[PDB]
């Protein structure tokens with residue numbers, strides 16, 4: 001059983017959910033966590049779905065080295081802030097100090113783009129569309145949290161180069177829509193699509209698009225994935241050029257990069273798990289249905305205790321043959337109540353209870369993990385009804401979370417409401433001038449990590465800004481509002 | 492085109508095959524290489540096949556961290572591990588190591604997860620990257636500082652379960668080589684000198700590179716017995732009598748070395764030759780007969796017919812692509828896809844179109860065969876099987892041609908200098924093996940490759956003795972020896 005509640009002590013409840021749910025094992029290297037099989041399976045489902053999508057689009061998979069040279073890391077950088085990256089440095093091999101230290105990759109721009117330059121010998125080599133499924137390392141000295149913010153993490157990073165800007169812009173949005181679908185269609189999590197402000201975009205790119213999710217327990221937002229248009233910034237840095245076929249001049253390609261991580265799993269937990277443990281979205285759950293025989297007594301029999309099991313096994317096999325990931329729990333040394341708790345902790349979407357009674361009556365009881373409701377299904381209907389049920393669960397889980405998100409997304413034009421909404425765990429849609437210094441003042445004034453940050457400029461604007469009358473929300477700015485921006489406390 | 496020959500200058504030829512075959516890009520950190528998509532697709536076929544296999548056996552996938560603490564590493568009881576000592580410009584309180592293998596990462600977790608008898612067995616696998624920072628000469632795919640692999644770690648209540656699993660995994664590795672890669676291998680047990688020092692015995696599959704004349708370990712599957720469980724206190728209490736029991740453990744691994752062996756065995760002086768079951772593209776269609784007088788409607792017509800055939804192949808599960816580029820001649824495309832090793836090239840011109848046929852050319856043979864279009868879906872798979880069989884059988888002939896059996900040291904050395912591997916009676920002593928290696932160099936001394944599961948004859952204890960003239964001992968078994976990588 002869980003020993004903390006999502007409302008009273010979120011970090012404790014989260015630690016208990018990931019350990020008692022057998023997702024994570026803690027490690028003696030801080031900021032790094034063991035992914036047990038139960039959570040790695042969810043990553044597998046996410047990874048395979050996304051890879052199939054981008055493969056169908058024409059991206060191809062490759063693998064570049066974990067180590068980056070110091071020369072490549074520092075390439076073409078001239079400002080002093082650029083020269084002390086927080087990368088992990090390998091300085092020796094056994095007892096031999098190395099000639100030149102080499103860095104663990106925090107991301108792979110620096111080692112892929114020299115190769116892109118070599119590989120693009122003419123305009124006919126374009127586009128180049130590659131992706132890696134790999135592990136990167138960012139050794140920051142802040143508070144790490146499993147899944148959400150770790151020093152080593154698994155991800156995919158796609159790096160694309162095109163002859164025209166139009167191609168690249170289109171791809172930025174196609175990839176962002178895939179990431180949105182990861183959250184909504186696989187994980188039943190609503191997200192907000194938008195552009196980062198100038199303050200929050202990737203500094204090496206032209207613009208950054210994002211999907212943001214909302215953690216109602218803390219009232220905080222978290223960036224779920226990212227999709228950048230780099231424009232020509234890196235092509236000019238790394239001389240990724242080709243000769244124009246018509247004008248014959250040297251032209252720089254247009255690039256994107258895009259990435260998503262195991263943070264997905266963290267968001268799933270933070271949004272869906274409850275005070276009894278995990279609640280797995282049906283489409284990624286390793287096991288969707290567990291069958292628990294019950295009604296066995298001390299004097300049930302032995303020759304009947306096996307009959308009940310036989311019927312449970314028959315139903316299990318039917319489910320598996322219908323494409324439903326199902327298992328039976330026939331362990332004799334654990335009570336049915338124990339098994340109930342154990343599989344609720346692991347968040348299996350449907351528990352089946354099957355007792356002698358219901359065997360007698362051609363039926364069984366299906367129990368939804370997300371809301372606890374029980375339903376009697378005639379065995380003849382198992383194959384028809386159980387898929388429908390799993391779809392319903394996904395939909396309830398999504399719509400539940402969506403209503404949460406919308407009821408805590410508050411539109412206002414008034415600074416006082418901005419502050420009040422922020423202290424009551426909302427995120428806020430407000431007219432915004434877009435300026436970096438104004439964003440700084442908004443953050444500094446809203447602090448009581450408690451200052452509000454911009455989350456994204458949402459593609460779906462809640463209303464149309466009137467450039468003629470609408471001003472920025474902050475009382476001391478006074479500039480024309482360029483758009484509505486989403487603000488909140490950012491995880 | 493390739494500018495070295497496999498039989499004259501093997502390393503230059505190898506480098507030209509992996510670069511012009513678009514497998515590898517060289518890289519400014521020595522001993523690490525970029526895997527382009529053409530080679531990574533091969534690793535992916537191997538990896539997905541092996542994973543489906545062990546998943547059906549009930550092994551489950553997990554992922555452990557790439558960093559190992561110094562204490563953890565030191566529990567194993569000098570090693571060329573890569574040490575992280577700084578983050579940015581802050582020196583770390585304690586240096587952490589890049590995993591060279593995950594025993595010291597995983598087995599503490601195992602000791603914790605095994606709380607009672609009912610938790611056994613534990614059978615976990617990871618697909619990950621490991622680092623071994625050796626200063627010896629590296630070679631792409633074959634010996635690298637960073638490599639991709641899978642490492643499996645299992646724990647059982649009894650030794651016999653574990654012995655069986657060792658053999659099961661070894662058999663899968665053999666199948667990767669023979670069935671996926673068309674490479675014959677010799678299953679065997681390592682000698683006491685060559686086994687993994689931390690286990691009880693090591694099993695292996697050994698392959699032979701005829702060009703080099705050298706043998707190479709293609710995979711490994713260890714029985715660790717109780718060594719590691721005693722080291723890491725991986726215990727349970729026996730349910731009746733409640734004595735403390737140490738679990739029995741195995742580990743097993745295979746790497747991108749597979750791809751290296753593939754090249755070394757099958758590639759030729761025109762480039763790669765991909766075994767059909769791992770080739771990312773199996774069939775490539777090249778449109779032929781386009782003159783400078785070929786009009787644009789006729790070019791559209793030929794391309795659309797090629798694309799129709801291409802998609803008919805893809806729908807029937809044959810991985811086929813068409814090369815519809817107009818800046819490259821048909822002959823250029825022939826050379827290009829030959830360098831890349833695509834098993835079948837289809838040549839489809841206008842005469843072919845009018846006769847409802849095409850020509851399929853085998854990359855391995857060069858042999859051409861005309862096929863009526865209606866029979867495409869039925870003949871093309873057969874051919875692909877034929878290619879696999881040819882490739883395997885060619886390699887197996889080449890391996891048995893280079894496998895020699897003797898009982899006399901003189902013939903043994905004559906064979907070693909003729910680029911052969913030699914089966915000889917052996918006592919199995921470490922000192923004697925050292926002596927055998929020492930008295931064959933003028934590394935080019937003779938090392939033991941494996942004690943083969945399938946012996947060439949019965950080492951009669953009353954008659955047969957060790958092959959070295961200075962060992963007086965009775966021969967325990969026939970051991971396969973040779974020069975190795």
Ligand SMILES: Cc1cc(N2CC[C@@](C#N)(C3CC3)C2=O)cc(NC(=O)Cc2ccccc2)n1
Nearest residue numbers: 138140144148149150151223224225259261263
């Ligand atoms: C698990 C995970 C995820 C992510 N990030 C980043 C943005 C992104 C998004 N969206 C990536 C583009 C895809 C994401 O998920 C980042 C991280 N570690 C870190 O920042 C390093 C760290 C370690 C300890 C404490 C503080 C910081 N750890």
Ligand SMILES: Cc1cc(N2CC[C@@](C#N)(C3CC3)C2=O)cc(NC(=O)Cc2ccccc2)n1
Nearest residue numbers: 623625627633634635638708709710744746748
């Ligand atoms: C690509 C690859 C493979 C393998 N090894 C090992 C044995 C094994 C087998 N069998 C593994 C158990 C599965 C194997 O494949 C090993 C390696 N690097 C190294 O030794 C590091 C190194 C670096 C430069 C020069 C010399 C040595 N690199």
Ligand SMILES: O=C(C[C@H]1NCCC[C@@H]1O)Cn1cnc2cc(Br)c(Cl)cc2c1=O
Nearest residue numbers: 085086087106107138157158226257258259
């Ligand atoms: O990592 C990025 C940009 C993009 N890379 C491709 C996948 C998607 C991803 O958002 C931004 N970023 C983030 N963190 C970093 C940390 C360090 Br340390 C360095 Cl050197 C560089 C970076 C750095 O470039």
Ligand SMILES: O=C(C[C@H]1NCCC[C@@H]1O)Cn1cnc2cc(Br)c(Cl)cc2c1=O
Nearest residue numbers: 570571572591592623642643711742743744
């Ligand atoms: O890595 C092994 C033993 C097995 N681990 C699991 C997968 C299969 C593999 O053969 C042997 N080995 C090989 N090379 C090593 C290099 C270093 Br450096 C260290 Cl510390 C340790 C080792 C080390 O333990």
Ligand SMILES: [Br-]
Nearest residue numbers: 200201202203
């Ligand atoms: Br950034």
Ligand SMILES: [Br-]
Nearest residue numbers: 107202226259
């Ligand atoms: Br990032």
Ligand SMILES: [Br-]
Nearest residue numbers: 685686687688
């Ligand atoms: Br070893």
Ligand SMILES: [Br-]
Nearest residue numbers: 592687711744
């Ligand atoms: Br090894």
Ligand SMILES: [Cl-]
Nearest residue numbers: 036037038553
């Ligand atoms: Cl696990």
Ligand SMILES: [Cl-]
Nearest residue numbers: 127128129130
């Ligand atoms: Cl590409």
Ligand SMILES: [Cl-]
Nearest residue numbers: 062527528529
């Ligand atoms: Cl590539």
Ligand SMILES: [Zn+2]
Nearest residue numbers: 433438472477
């Ligand atoms: Zn403003």
Ligand SMILES: [Zn+2]
Nearest residue numbers: 918923957962
């Ligand atoms: Zn001897």
